[PDB]
Symmetry: C3
Subunit: 187 residues, 3 copies
């Protein structure tokens, strides 16, 4: 994982659960609590895994619930980093465009490997979006969608329709329903 | 053709010529007049061709003129679907970018095969746009250009300079003149 | 070089130093002073070099400072060509997106070959941008950066880190420092 996102995860945990929940979890993996992380350095994913587990232990929350909440928060932060990915979009545009956006981000943040997110309009008012990765961060995936709904102020319902691990990849498909048609024809 | 665009055509034909005309046209090709079409289903092009023919027969309007008008109307609709492809562009930007947008759309609407649109800055205040497709929807192409002009509120003159079915591909080249330079200083 | 860009430069040289310096510099390479330059014709690079050489000789200005000035001036023009590349971006966004933008320009302007511009966020408040080209227009590169800074109204500090030519390619690496973080939290 790139320092860019991780540095942000740390700071988001700090806002969510407090400083010396985060301080002590950081110590748990042998980091000084005020460790400075650079945007392009490589952080061991397992260290991140261990950090989030400790926060869970310390907070009484399941880690999946924490990843979800962090996913919710991060949409706003991403919107500050790259407002032009958000500007003038419908929510459904934003979600359908996200795989292509992640691909452009890999050309700008060397070594970044965001997941594949192929989205498909399956009905007049719904898409299916499939998360595909070597990393299995289902809950973060869902939180980011929820956070996207809040950012665009378009209500959705999200249902998991499929989950699975095949040939080294984690996969998760959701069906997302909107209040208006995806491709509405109007007067 | 993908149901996405076909569903839109049907509704556009209904607004233009009425429900009873479209229903009967749908029936004439063996569809429920109220056929439910999903965004990604594959609709036979020849059935669409026949629907449009029957509408022309019933309204008395030449089918070419029907395509041109459907093209004029559809620009508005596309701008409601994907407003960020329109926002902050000059018309000439919009037209020159259209080939890449159609490509990005193939990545979002699986199996869509919109025409190739080679656009070239040919003179200071003019471009050439070449439509290249296996479908020969000349008038529709011309309608979308006209619709874009109205949407961006930039008057243009468009002259067809080339028409022909070279390969398995139909091709149509137009010269598009703007009131502004393409690359204005 | 494509005529689209050469014509802009001619117009910029005229704005800066006047029609007489430019007219004589065009004649010097065998052009009519009012020769029409089409957006897609291909202009010989060495002719452009000699034109800029003659302008330097006639004005007394160092050719490097000329390219720098022209680069500063041109950002505003580019924003008139393609405002949607500037719209709603932060300066750091604009600079990191430029390589993909130059790549998409080659798809709209046939035969255009802008330099490769690899940018890397190297620190919390700075990026590295490496200019790489078959051509050697270091000062134009730097002026365009300064011009970007002015257009986006965001101050930067620019430091050269490395420059050099190998097997026909010129490279220039700068470090660009901002007043605000690249990936700001809250
Ligand atoms: C402009 C908005 C966004 C930006 C800038 C962004 C950026 C990133 C970055 C930089 C990474 C790091 C990859 C790495 O370190 O190797 C990442 C990972 C991730 N991104 Fe995006 N993201 C955005 C929106 C989204 C959205 C809407 C989703 C919705 C699913 C999403 C899903 C994920 C997930 C689940 C990961 C976790 C790593 C993994 O699953 O393997 N992102 N994102
Ligand atoms: C954002 C604006 C636009 C969108 C979203 C859009 C989208 C589409 C879609 C979904 C199709 C269906 C393809 C299929 O079913 O395989 C299509 C086909 C087509 N597009 Fe576009 N389009 C846009 C603008 C334009 C413009 C400006 C032109 C021409 C100047 C154009 C020319 C055409 C034509 C003529 C067809 C069908 C005819 C054929 O196959 O030759 N479109 N477009
Ligand atoms: C949206 C803004 C921009 C546009 C539309 C643009 C477009 C172009 C075009 C059309 C060319 C001519 C290619 C040819 O004739 O072969 C060019 C060359 C060049 N561009 Fe860009 N450019 C933009 C922004 C920038 C920026 C921010 C830089 C930053 C340095 C830059 C650096 C250069 C350089 C140094 C050259 C030609 C010299 C060489 O090969 O070294 N441009 N640009």
């Amino acid at each position: 994982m790139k320092g860019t996102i991780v540095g942000t995860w740390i700071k988001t945990l700090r806002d969510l659960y407090g400083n010396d929940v985060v301080d002590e979890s950081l110590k748990s993996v042998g980091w000084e609590p005020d460790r400075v992380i650079t945007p392009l350095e490589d952080i061991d994913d397992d260290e991140v895994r261990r950090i989030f587990a400790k926060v869970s232990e310390k907070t009484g929350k399941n880690v999946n619930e924490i990843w979800r909440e962090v996913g919710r928060q991060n949409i706003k932060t991403f919107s500050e980093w790259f407002p032009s990915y958000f500007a003038g979009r419908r929510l459904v545009n934003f979600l359908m465009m996200m795989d292509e956006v992640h691909l452009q981000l890999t050309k700008m943040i060397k070594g970044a490997t965001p997941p594949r997110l192929i989205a498909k309009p399956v009905a007049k008012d719904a898409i299916e979006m499939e998360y595909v990765s070597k990393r299995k961060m289902y809950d973060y995936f869902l939180g980011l969608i929820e956070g996207s709904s809040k950012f665009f102020k378009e209500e959705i319902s999200v249902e998991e329709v499929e989950r699975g691990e095949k040939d080294g990849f984690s996969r998760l498909k959701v069906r997302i329903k909107f209040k208006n048609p995806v491709f509405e024809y109007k007067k």
